[PDB]
Amino acid sequence: APMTEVEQKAAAGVFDDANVRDRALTDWDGMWQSVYPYLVSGELDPVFRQKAKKDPEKTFEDIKAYYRKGYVTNVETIGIENGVIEFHRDNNVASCKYNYAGYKILTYASGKKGVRYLFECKDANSKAPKYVQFSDHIIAPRKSAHFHIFMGNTSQQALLQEMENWPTYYPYQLKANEVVDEMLHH
């Protein structure tokens, strides 16, 4: 089902902490493609033009740069199923079964808020990131349409400080025109 008014607002970074609930990894089940190659090929340009158009203080170039830095990753593909996350990084592959480590409510410099969902790989000698945090503009159980994922090997606390890079994933099947469509409307 589509989004309630509380869900739309939470998605814009406006919510009561009392409404935030735990989510399960199954909210992100599925096969997913990085949006980064579409920024690279220039196919996300219409997204950045609309953002520039709607705010006279912004420029296309600086909006795109911000997204470039945000989206950049070589993990082109992520698969999620049965508690396992698979990471395809160029010709390298890696997977691990992930345990839930709770959620964190963040307030950003902008004054907007968001929730990250923290997972841990406890198989300490895997090539899969040890720490993973999902952020997808949702604050309570609901299947993701797309997500940002923070990946790190040092600590969860350290990853919570990451604000610049946020590799971003949409359903594997979607074409670039469909990714654009979702960005411009949802």
Please report where in the chains the tokens 């735990």 appear, as a residue.
22
For 96-144, give the DSSP string: EEEEEEEEEEEE-TTS-EEEEEEEEE--TT-SS-SEEEEE-S--SS---
**What's 54-85 look like in SS3?**
CCCCCCHHHHHHHHHHHHCCCEEEEEEECCEE
Q: How many other CB atoms are there within 10 angstroms of residue 133's CB atom?
A: 23
Domain range list for the chain: 1-186
This entry's atomic model was obtained through: X-ray
Read off the tokens for 10: 């939470």
Q: Does the CA dihedral 172-173-176-179 come out positive or negative? A: negative
**Crossing angle of helices 176-185/45-53, nearest 10°?**
20
State the architecture of 1-186 in CATH terms: Beta Barrel (2.40)
* 3-class DSSP assignment, residue 86: strand
Spatial contact of 49 and 67, defined as CB atoms under 8 Å apart: no
